[PDB]
Design a protein around this nucleic acid. Structure first.
Ligand SMILES: *O[C@H]1[C@@H](O)[C@H](n2cnc3c(=O)[nH]c(N)nc32)O[C@@H]1COP(=O)(O)OP(=O)(O)OP(=O)(O)O
Ligand SMILES: C[S@@+](CC[C@H](N)C(=O)[O-])C[C@H]1O[C@@H](n2cnc3c(N)ncnc32)[C@H](O)[C@@H]1O
Ligand SMILES: [Zn+2]
Ligand SMILES: [Zn+2]
Lengths: 284, 678
RNA sequence: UAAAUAUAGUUUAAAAACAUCAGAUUGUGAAUCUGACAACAGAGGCUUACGACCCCUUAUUUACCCCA
């Protein structure tokens, strides 16, 4: 394609472009319909390869430092199998959670409104979210709702989880949350909700929108939560935090960590400790 | 080295509504040509920031050109712009002095008039020439034409070309020399004195455009024999990109004007701004009215909308790009599709059901009709203009309660082709006080009334204006210095029509008699309302019996209550919202509760609220008090006495339509309370 | 309306540190190894280049209260 030759002249001009581009990424260069959009894409690949190089250089630096250390160089109760045993322990908790645990829903109905960039970030955030849930003392029973089998978000989840996808102790279904739970016990979380969250309710199912809208579309979570007559709630960020800068729409990982410690009989202060510190200047 | 994106955008496309206005954009400087009545709004509505303006160029000293000029200065004063230069006729100096009669000291902002006598205005972007054109047999004869010549732009550096000959690339290293390469100075590198002309792209000589106004047939001959124009006509080294013609259709068709237009290159684009366009300017007004029309077609009527040289007919937000390419950009052209507005309204949560249920519920003389031409304070917005209420006493008589910048345009979009008969119908204008939103529209109505009388063939006689004395001084100055308007006015001081007023001169007494006789009224009283002095409310009593009362800007006033006893209709103001009582006392305004309470003391059969703020614009916050007696005015809302019972029923549909804006206004109230607490 | 402001895991800095994910039966530096992910709000420009410079959108904060 002409794009392969196209990038050549951009390389000469030194517009922050990386050394080589994989054929996969060539396809995504065709997607960009603007010079400006191409610029933002090339810069991302430029910084990506730079960090790859720096990490590798720091890697083999460590490897060379480790091998020279080896040259320089009892009654135990336990073998060192802690990482293995922890994974098993977290497994047992996950199975228990799937039977008895409180539901928590991620709504995956937002693929349409997201671009490729935002879609990977959602999956990155989902990965972190499930992790914090896994490692918790009282895990949520995590539901992936409105997840198409052949969808982009499903395809991306499978890639990041590999064989672990099948073995994850969460429920993924193409069905909606209104189909799985009584409609009265569903509280949809969104920053745009007029209703403030006063206390964490253990009888309620909370729905979190799997939506990273860097290109901000306000009210989309609220619109879904109104089309289906669901209750909406927003976090008491205004009440407890001195908001100065930043978006009040938090990331998924932050949301779950706020809920997890709310569920675990914490107060709002302990909960809002996960709210990015750059966004507020203390508790009021 | 000069701005790299320059374009001309058409604010007003020359229709009878808006006049002509031309907005010039660059990276560094923003210009506006002319400043008609309603440019301020046309610009705010279309997200053209006025806060950045450097010069306002005015082609003529006419109310068409300078109507909205007193308007912007107030506003861009607020934005906090330190300086603004008015370029055009020398009489602009005296115009500014006239404006200050009612507009306050106009301190905080510096207005320096640079007339056509002055040397040229040089900028980052362009150097602007003023050409004074004098008609063939205070100056009525002066128009100014603008030739705006863009500065030379340094050629783009070709790094490829440098490395082609073997000269080092040095994106950062040779960057000091790159500046010299841009400047075109010879480069010592490559072991020889290589000129930088070949290194950089060809520097464009600079594009010029002409803004020429030819008001009528007089000015055609002077334009065609102008020495200054002839310099830019046919001279190869100096091409003209665009000409913006603000001439009417009659002027352009003339052989002499056609020949002159041909004399600019065949490559020159010609833009025309005149009445032939009749494009839509105020989109949001059209949108809202189309949606309001669903609720009640009668109370919310529809707004009326519509060779030798290749000319491009001006449309709103039409764009001609000068750099980095010369082309017509038609991207941001205003598109109005009524069907789309309807579908959007119908898709709203509860609007469909509320409107439907109104019709289920549904299933006095026709005159007077009160037409609310505009129902907002101070700065005009998308949805509400400044103050105007039209009272149609009879098919053949009407009376204008206040007339502000934008008012004639409201009338013109309300009536369309029928504005001629309405203007000829108009008998009186009442001005409550001398705030610049109650009278600034008057000169347009005066001038347009003249045009309407000529078309209908009726004799031209003065318009009866009831206003404070201070208005005469403003108009006397404008008449003396700028433009003749005082022959259109027979002014009755508002203090003459007060109850227990001393018998004025026999002239005024005779004028008062003609006021009553023309409008077919038994009484026309005024009283001193409580609004920063010399502020009046009026009462119309018609021979039939009905009384209608206009408060104007005021506070709760005993005098107005005593005057308007057992009025059929009260028109009061709700500029502030309930809970902002401390705002009202200092601004000398009313809240919604206060306004209603005044109505109830008068035993008014119905109460309409106007002069809302923008703080409550899209939908005034409907207090629960007195549903059946209280109504809310929108622009282009027609109210008869027959419509008194339907007005209560319109609230459920109206609330549904403006539900989005209600939420936000309620949050402001809640946030304010939180802010008060914190 | 005007101003600053906007780190999608968190900070700091003007790229790192700490985090995240998959694999591992680890002889107790696994204090590791092999992979995955790497986008300083969003869109479009200008320029030799830039997170500067322009513009728009959204959002935050504050000021204003609407043309005082
Ligand atoms: O141009 C502004 C301005 O005139 C006005 N405005 C709103 N809040 C303030 C304020 O605190 N101070 C001042 N001086 N002016 C204020 O609103 C205009 C912006 O309105 P938009 O047209 O951008 O949006 P709109 O309200 O129509 O939006 P929506 O509520 O219908 O969604
Ligand atoms: C970044 S938000 C998505 C923003 C989207 N525009 C919207 O309208 O929600 C990702 C999810 O986190 C949750 N969330 C984030 N901030 C929240 C807040 N302040 N209150 C409640 N839920 C919040 C919501 O469930 C939301 O769908
Ligand atoms: Zn007013
Ligand atoms: Zn007033």
């Amino acid at each position: 394609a002409a794009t392969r030759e196209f990038i050549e002249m951009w390389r000469l001009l030194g517009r922050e472009v990386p050394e080589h581009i994989t054929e996969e990424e060539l396809k995504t260069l065709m997607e960009c319909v603007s010079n400006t959009a191409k610029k933002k894409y090339l810069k991302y690949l430029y910084t990506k390869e730079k960090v790859k190089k720096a990490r590798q250089i720091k890697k083999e630096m460590k490897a060379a430092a480790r091998e020279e250390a080896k040259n320089i160089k009892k009654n135990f109760l336990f073998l060192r199998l802690w990482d293995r045993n922890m994974d098993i322990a977290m497994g047992w908790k996950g199975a228990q959670a799937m039977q008895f645990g409180q539901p928590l829903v991620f709504d995956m109905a937002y693929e349409n409104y997201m671009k490729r960039k935002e879609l990977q970030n959602t999956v990155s955030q989902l990965l972190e979210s499930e992790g914090w849930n896994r490692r918790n003392v009282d895990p949520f029973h995590i539901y992936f709702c409105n997840l198409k089998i052949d969808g982009a978000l499903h395809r991306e989840l499978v890639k990041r989880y590999q064989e672990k996808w099948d073995k994850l102790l969460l429920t993924s279904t193409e069905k909606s949350h209104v189909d799985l739970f009584p409609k009265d016990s569903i509280i949809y979380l969104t920053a745009d909700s007029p209703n403030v969250m006063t206390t964490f309710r253990h009888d309620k199912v909370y729905v979190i929108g799997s939506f990273v809208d860097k290109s901000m579309q306000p009210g989309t979570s609220l619109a879904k939560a109104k089309r289906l007559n669901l209750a909406t709630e927003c976090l008491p960020l205004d009440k407890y935090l001195q908001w100065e800068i930043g978006n009040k729409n938090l990331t998924l990982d932050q949301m779950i960590r706020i809920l997890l410690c709310l569920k675990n009989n914490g107060n709002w202060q302990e909960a809002l400790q996960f709210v990015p510190k750059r966004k507020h200047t203390g508790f009021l | 080295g000069g701005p790299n994106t320059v374009y001309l955008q058409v604010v007003a496309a020359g229709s009878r509504d808006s006049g002509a206005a031309l907005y010039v954009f660059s990276e560094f400087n923003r210009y506006l040509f002319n400043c008609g009545e309603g440019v301020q709004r046309l610009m705010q509505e279309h997200k053209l920031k006025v806060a950045r303006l450097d010069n306002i160029f005015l082609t003529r000293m006419h109310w068409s050109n300078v109507g909205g000029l007193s308007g912007m200065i107030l506003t861009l004063k607020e934005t906090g712009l330190p300086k603004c230069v008015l370029s055009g006729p020398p009489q602009l100096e005296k115009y500014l002095e006239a404006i200050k009669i009612f507009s306050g000291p106009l301190k905080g902002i510096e207005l320096a008039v640079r007339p056509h006598s002055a040397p040229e205005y040089e900028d980052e972007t362009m150097t602007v020439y003023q050409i004074p054109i004098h008609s063939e047999q205070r100056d009525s004869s002066l128009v100014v034409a603008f030739i705006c010549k863009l500065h030379l732009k340094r050629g783009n550096f070709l790094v490829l070309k440098a490395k082609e000959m073997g000269l080092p690339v040095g994106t950062a290293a040779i960057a000091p020399i790159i500046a010299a390469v841009k400047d075109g100075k010879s480069i010592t590198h490559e072991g020889r004195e290589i000129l930088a002309e070949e290194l950089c792209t060809p520097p464009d000589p600079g594009a010029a455009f002409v803004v020429v106004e030819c008001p009528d047939e007089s000015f055609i001959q002077p334009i065609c024999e102008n020495a200054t124009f002839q310099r830019y006509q046919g001279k190869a080294d100096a091409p003209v990109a665009l000409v913006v013609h603000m001439a009417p259709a009659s002027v352009l068709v003339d052989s002499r004007y056609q020949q002159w237009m041909e004399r600019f290159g065949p490559d020159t684009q010609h833009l025309v701004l005149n009445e032939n366009c009749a494009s839509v300017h105020n989109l949001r007004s059209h949108k809202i009215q189309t949606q309001l029309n669903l609720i009640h077609p009668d109370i919310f009527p529809l707004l009326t909308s519509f060779l030798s040289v290749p000319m491009v007919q001006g449309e709103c937000l039409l764009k001609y790009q000068l750099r980095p390419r010369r082309e017509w950009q038609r991207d941001a052209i205003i598109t109005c599709n009524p069907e789309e507005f309807i579908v959007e309204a119908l898709q709203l949560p509860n609007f469909q059901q509320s409107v439907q249920e109104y019709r289920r519920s549904a299933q006095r003389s026709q005159y007077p009709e009160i037409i609310f031409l505009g129902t907002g304070s101070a700065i005009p917005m998308k949805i509400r203009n400044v103050s105007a209420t039209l009272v149609n006493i009879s098919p053949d008589t009407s009376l204008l309660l206040d007339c502000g910048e934008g008012t004639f345009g409201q009338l013109c979009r309300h009536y369309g082709d029928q504005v001629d008969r309405v203007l000829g119908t108009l008998a009186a204008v009442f001005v409550s006080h001398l705030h610049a939103d109650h009278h600034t529209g008057l000169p347009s109505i005066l001038l347009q009334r003249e045009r309407a009388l000529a078309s209908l063939g009726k004799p031209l006689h003065p318009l009866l204006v009831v206003a404070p004395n201070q208005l005469k001084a403003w108009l006397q100055q404008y008449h003396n210095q700028c433009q003749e308007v005082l022959h259109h006015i027979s002014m009755i001081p508002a203090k003459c029509l007060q109850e227990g007023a001393e018998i004025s001169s026999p002239a005024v007494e005779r004028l008062i008699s003609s006021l009553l006789r023309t409008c077919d009224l038994e009484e026309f009283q005024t009283c001193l309302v409580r609004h920063c002095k010399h502020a009046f409310g009026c009462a119309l009593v018609h021979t039939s019996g009905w009384k209608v009362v206009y408060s104007g800007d005021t506070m709760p006033c005993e005098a107005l209550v005593r005057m308007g006893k057992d009025a059929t209709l009260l028109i009061h103001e709700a500029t502030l919202e309930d809970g902002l009582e401390e705002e009202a006392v200092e601004k000398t305004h009313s809240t919604t509760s206060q306004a209603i309470s005044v109505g109830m003391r008068m035993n008014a059969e119905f109460i309409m609220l106007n002069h809302f703020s923008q703080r409550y614009a899209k939908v005034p916050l409907f207090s629960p008090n007195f549903s059946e007696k209280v109504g809310v005015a929108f622009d282009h809302m027609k109210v008869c006495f027959g419509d008194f019972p339907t007005m209560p029923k319109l609230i459920p549909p109206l609330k549904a339509l403006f539900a989005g804006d209600i939420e936000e206004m309620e949050e402001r109230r809640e946030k304010r309370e939180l802010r008060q607490v914190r």
